[PDB]
Amino acid sequence: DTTVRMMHIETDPNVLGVWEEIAKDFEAKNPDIKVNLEFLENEAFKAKLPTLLQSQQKPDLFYSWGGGNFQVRAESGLLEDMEGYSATLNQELSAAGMNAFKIDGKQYGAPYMVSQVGFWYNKKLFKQAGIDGESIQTWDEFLTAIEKLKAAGITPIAVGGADKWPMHFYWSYLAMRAGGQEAFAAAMQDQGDGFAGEAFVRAGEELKRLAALEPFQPGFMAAGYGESAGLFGDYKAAIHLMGDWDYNFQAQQAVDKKGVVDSDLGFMNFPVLKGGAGAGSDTLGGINGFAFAKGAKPEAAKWLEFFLNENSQTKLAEIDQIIPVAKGADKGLKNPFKQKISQTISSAQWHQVFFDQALGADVGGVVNDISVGIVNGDVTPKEAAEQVQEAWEMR
Template sequence: MKQSQTSRRSFLALAALTPLAAMTTTACGTSGPGSSSGGGASMWYLTGEPNQTIEQKAVDAFNSANPNNKISTTFFQNDAYKTKIKTAIGAGQAPTIIYGWGGGTLKAYAEANQVDDLTSWFDQNPDVKNKFFPSVFGAATVNGKIYAIPNQYIAPIVLFYNKELFAKAGVQPPKTWDDIMSLVKTFNGMGVAPFALGGQSRWTSMMWLEYLLDRIGGAGVFKAIFEGKPNAWMDPAVIETGTKIQELVSADGFIKGFSSITADSNADQALLFTGKAAMMLHGSWTYGSMKKDGQNFVQNGKLGFVNFPTVAGGKGDPKNGVGNPAQYMSISSKASDAEKESAKKFFKDGILTDTVLTAYVNTGSVPIVNGIEDKLSASADKDFLNFVYDMAKNAPNFQQSWDQALSPTAAEALLNNIDQLFLKSITPQQFAQNMNATLGK
């Protein structure tokens, strides 16, 4: 599951060049970016297990069944890929199939006519589109058109809690923001930090803003921000979100010294499973790492999980989710017609097959397709997997993580301002004004 954590943040490309360390695997020969032999297509993908092995096996199975439409694959380390794909697309030498995270980067590609509009193809293949959760298409859609097919699994942000500490305190998990503020007092009174937070990583703090803004203002507030509408960051819901966060900080809602704790080290997770913190808002991928490293905390049934609470008077649907809706694949506009047809055939017959679905479930992930309840229920982790599945499937809106949805420039400004907001070195109004200046960048 740690690979999921890397994937979650991988949209934000902060530009230092990394040695390319690419590994090419080919069943039909790779003749360079954007070209392949035998009427097939080329695809670039990320290294890292278990995703790399699962994807390569899917490609091998497809190539065996479709000798005239083979897919050649090249694997890159995460940071190297982000540098390489940007250069290749700019030079008109992209692979046929472009792996990505949707959101701001896909929007830039689409508006520059570098990837194909797949809307009519999905209309002609409703069985393909209907296979996926409806909510995962948001990050693949630009100006009402679909430019990518979703792939892999969903990773929502979840409110985790320590059942043992809650039983000791005689309290229930929070259903409202008022409940959260009450629990802060309860656990501080017990000498336990209410919430673990790896604040030095910044994107962990962002999760709080994502959910709060949705619960307070509804999904439309960030939609306006994503679309770059004038003064979208100045919406009153943004100010209220920042105000509530600073009230939580002032009430000692987070572990002392949270700004020096990193998420990459899993120190925030350790605070939860060792009983030093009662709750943690984090990605679903942390379930697997806590199961692995948590001293049987998960196996002994001490880990609880719920959706983010409601806010009194808020406009957001309490079923809305935030996080990583999926990973995505687009088709390069520079590819030949034959390559594009091979890519579409792979999209239809090669991704998220029954074998692939089983492989993802066995790694503790929830694939983004309907009708897999039996597979999830057969897992030892069925309670959590079914929770994530139902949460994702039933979400009226699933908001992609902000640092992925926004452009890289706006995303870095966001993380910097979030850090200052949580440290109370800027006011909620200043946060909104600073972010408003990034619209259109």
């Protein structure tokens, strides 16, 4: 007998019940392979992973956003090439998802889900304030909605400021809308002014403009994602900029365990910006998966083949958690919120990975720091953009 160890960040009880049913089924079909799921909370996982990967405590598999840390971990010899065990994975999963985890002919991981960040909103609170959420197409319209919400005495936005990344979604999206894919491409290459360019300065300027409306909950800087999601679920804030995993999370974090119910819930894409080079269809999100740590056993790929299979992924789409990567599992996307989000992801010409993840722990950490820093007045838009660029050039 051998044990496959998979480290993950999932907290949802319905997701874990599905994962455990899949593991139980796999263990019956593979009597010599056991599966151990190892939970570590998102923030703790990101901070502790570097130590874990250099140690004897490392698992076979661990959750991954791809992006910058994945590239450096692969180059540093911290991952295991499973190309010789990837045939079924390649047959059952999206080609793009598989390619996100492949480098230099080496398959270092496999995809689990794709996601979109957008504005979840409360239709009940919007109606109270006089706002038609389906009519918010522009950033100026969004800001007008913020003012209306404030006028009605409703906290406009819930944000998990303590964790930083929930605020970075604003800076990132504004940069995307101002500059388009081309400004971002130049910035990654450090061409011209790079990340210190006009679109990134504009992003901070517009973030500062939002912040000046005081749209967040009191104490937002001490709030993590869980608190922010709870506030939205408890009808105490009208808007939550977040990935699509929030649907189930806001319900779990609500005191009533239901949150904003479907009749009261809306979702909108990030709006467009006047004079911007970006399109409203461009999406921020990503392709998340599981990476193989150096030393991973072949049985880990056998587990992954089954865990990421069509039937498995169909269940996870049916419980409204993920937009799947397994071929055919999109049949599980019956919920209209998730069905629409899946079409946006598919139609997106630019599908950008979360900036913090695209840039790696250091430079992404700077983006996270400057997002809350702009809001708090620590740095100006210009200083913020310059910091990102300088850290990126050194990387």
